[PDB]
């Protein structure tokens, strides 16, 4: 196939960068900080200006000391290593990465449309065609990632940005890992967790296809299939094998969702003999032109409004915080390959 060929060349490209990662391609003083776009446990994302090019980027800042306390060293090394090596239309481009005494930095392409999350909650829910446009782009992305033996593990509206053209950009590869065969780390976000993960069984790429189904459901229904006020209550709902669809769900949608939200891994779409084709040749995606989604020529159902470069009006406001850099190098050995 021409997809198979595209992937084969793509694996050669990825392997070259994987084996020989890039390093310290910038310094903090080359950027002007502007606004915190987002926050997390190990640090925040900031809109940043590249003073020499005048280009705006999103810069993810991780406090080394906090990464270590939360036992995320290996995870943080995976994220930079994978992200500098991959290249796909719906994956954030990592432009620069560097570290100082106190922090790790990854400068990435800035997607002014904001988080899908923000629009999804506001509007309430997406129409199937709307949801499908976004879903189709995730299907391709996973197809590509999984061909590289990468698992993604944190799919959710929060990690999907809308760019200027209204296409998705997958950020946050904080849990991405290159694994042939199986892995056991409990990570992800409670609502998106596959039962395998919560049952400490050992798991593989298939958890991404489960998460895709949570996503489609949440986009189309405006809420996730398993919610509750505390995580344990959510985990029970997930392991129970029991989903209710809203009544406005097309039956094709329900049907795709039932195969994706399947507790039996041997039976879950994405994990069978035909892998990703079971998803792409499903009735719900009949309307979808995959090559054209890939080539970015489909009209996006929703272009967010942006009144310039560096406009941040599609992001919530956060409390700012002065970037402290210690005079002592903080965890050199642990992060040497960053």
């Amino acid at each position: 196939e021409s997809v198979k060929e595209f992937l084969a060349k793509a694996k050669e490209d990825f392997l070259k960068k994987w084996e020989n990662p890039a390093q310290n391609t910038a310094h903090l003083d080359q950027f002007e900080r502007i606004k915190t776009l987002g926050t997390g446990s190990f640090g925040r994302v900031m809109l940043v200006k590249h003073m020499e090019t005048g280009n705006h980027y999103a810069m993810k800042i991780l406090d080394k000391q906090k990464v270590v306390k939360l036992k995320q060293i290996e995870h943080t090394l995976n994220e930079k290593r994978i992200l500098q090596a991959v290249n796909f239309p719906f994956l954030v481009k990592l432009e620069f990465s560097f570290k100082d005494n106190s922090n790790l930095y990854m400068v990435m392409e800035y997607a002014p449309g904001g988080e899908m999350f923000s629009h999804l909650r506001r509007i309430g829910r997406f129409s199937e065609p709307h949801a499908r446009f976004y879903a189709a782009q995730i299907v391709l992305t996973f197809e590509y990632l999984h061909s590289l033996d990468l698992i993604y593990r944190d799919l959710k509206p929060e990690n999907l940005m809308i760019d200027q053209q209204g296409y998705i950009q997958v950020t946050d590869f904080g849990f991405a890992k290159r694994v042939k065969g199986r892995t056991w780390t409990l990570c992800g976000t409670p609502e998106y967790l596959a039962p395998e993960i919560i049952l400490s069984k050992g798991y593989n790429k298939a958890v991404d296809w489960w998460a895709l189904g949570v996503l489609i459901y949440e986009m189309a229904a405006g809420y996730p299939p398993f919610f509750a006020d505390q995580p344990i209550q959510i985990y029970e709902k997930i392991v129970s094998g029991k989903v209710r669809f809203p009544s406005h769900f097309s039956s094709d949608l329900k049907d795709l969702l039932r195969n994706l939200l399947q507790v039996d891994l041997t039976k879950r779409f994405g994990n069978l003999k035909n892998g990703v084709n079971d998803i792409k040749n499903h009735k719900w995606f009949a309307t979808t032109d995959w090559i054209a989604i890939y080539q970015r020529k489909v009209e996006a159902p929703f272009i967010p409004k942006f009144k310039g470069p560096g406009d941040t009006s599609n992001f919530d406001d956060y409390e700012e915080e002065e970037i402290r850099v210690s005079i002592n190098e903080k965890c050199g050995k642990e992060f040497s390959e960053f």
């Binding site: 999350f117 909650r121 929060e158 976000t189 409670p190 405006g222 809420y223 919610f227 006020d229 505390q230």
Partner: peptide
């Protein structure tokens, strides 16, 4: 309604990952 129970729940905001 389910929407209304969701909206009244503690998890309509941005959801943090669990680490370990």
């Amino acid at each position: 309604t389910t929407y209304a129970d969701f909206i009244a729940s503690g998890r309509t905001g941005r959801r943090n990952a669990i680490h370990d």
